[PDB]
Amino acid sequence: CGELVWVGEPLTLRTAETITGKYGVWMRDPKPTYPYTQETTWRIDTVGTDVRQVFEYDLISQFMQGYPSKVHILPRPLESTGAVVYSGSLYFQGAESRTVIRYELNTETVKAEKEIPGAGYHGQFPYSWGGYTDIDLAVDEAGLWVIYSTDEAKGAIVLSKLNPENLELEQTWETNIRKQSVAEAFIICGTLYTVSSYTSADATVNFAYDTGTGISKTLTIPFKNRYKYSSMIKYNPLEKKLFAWDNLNMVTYDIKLSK
């Protein structure tokens, strides 16, 4: 679980789109929990205002291969498609709010709701590609996180580790990078990494903040994005890959860590 040293070229995901026909924003659980398995996937369709539908699929279904097994109707709409599934629950930001909601998928139950203290929302502290990217939920090898900013932090990235059961903020770190200066961010092995553009063609993983030590540094790892679409990239620690949505396709990026 060392420092990132390389990011691969983006590879189009064809699996879920092939079996289902939907390009959709796809999510997988890095801690699959019975009765779900590694073949289970969830899609948020990105069409419409105040989206509440999450579609659940078994891609090796013995009953209805190709069609959703279940459609969940969330009790609050999504602020953005940047939700995560972790340990059997969907964690999402409620529209027009700084609230994170834990929705248990197999029981359709809200198990926790938490206001992220002081967090900006709805266009106050977006990433550099704009949109409602103020609050970014992330999963890594140690569980669930949230990436945000606050007025007191003057727009610098704040990072909190979340208790997945009750959404308490178990530890917080105020980092030394402005959120609006980077295009997206993700956590790998307890290090926050950010992506920046530095010309019209060229982007890099440009910064690292290690939550274990507090130490940060500039990086220059090439990051080959196809587009500049306001979204959140999500690390999947089970697959050890980054998953991104660009409005056309889901793509994965392979990673290498120093050994």
Author numbering: 245 to 503
Give the original sentences from the paper that presented this experimental model.
For myoc-OLFN428E/D478K the difference upon the addition of calcium is within the error of DSF (±2°C), suggesting that myoc-OLFN428E/D478K cannot bind calcium; for myoc-OLFN428D/D478H a marginal stabilization was observed with calcium, suggesting weak if any calcium binding. Instead of not being visible (myoc-OLFD478S), or adopting a well ordered and helical loop at the top face (wild type), residues 260–265 are shifted ∼10 Å from the original top-face helical loop and are now in the approximate location of the myoc-OLFWT side helix. In turn, the residues previously forming the side helix (303–310) form an extended loop conformation. Finally, unlike myoc-OLFD478S, the loop composed of residues 291–295 is ordered, although shifted ∼3 Å from its defined position in myoc-OLFWT. In the central cavity, a salt bridge between Asp380 and Lys478 (2.6 Å) is observed, with the terminal N∊ atom occupying the position of the Na+ ion modeled in myoc-OLFWT. In addition, Lys478 is within hydrogen-bonding distance of the main-chain carbonyls of Gly326 and Leu381, and Asp380 forms a new hydrogen-bonding interaction with Tyr371 (2.7 Å). The position of Tyr371 appears to be shifted ∼0.6 Å compared with the wild type, but still forms a cation–π interaction with Lys423; both of these residues are conserved in Echinodermata OLFs with the Asp–Glu–Lys triad. Like Asn428 in myoc-OLFD478S, Glu428 is no longer in the central cavity and instead forms hydrogen bonds to water molecules present in a cavity between blades D and E. In myoc-OLFWT this cavity is largely hydrophobic, and is lined with Trp373, Val439, Phe467 and Ile477. Overall, OLF domains harboring the Asp–Glu–Lys triad do not appear to be capable of metal-ion binding in the central pore.
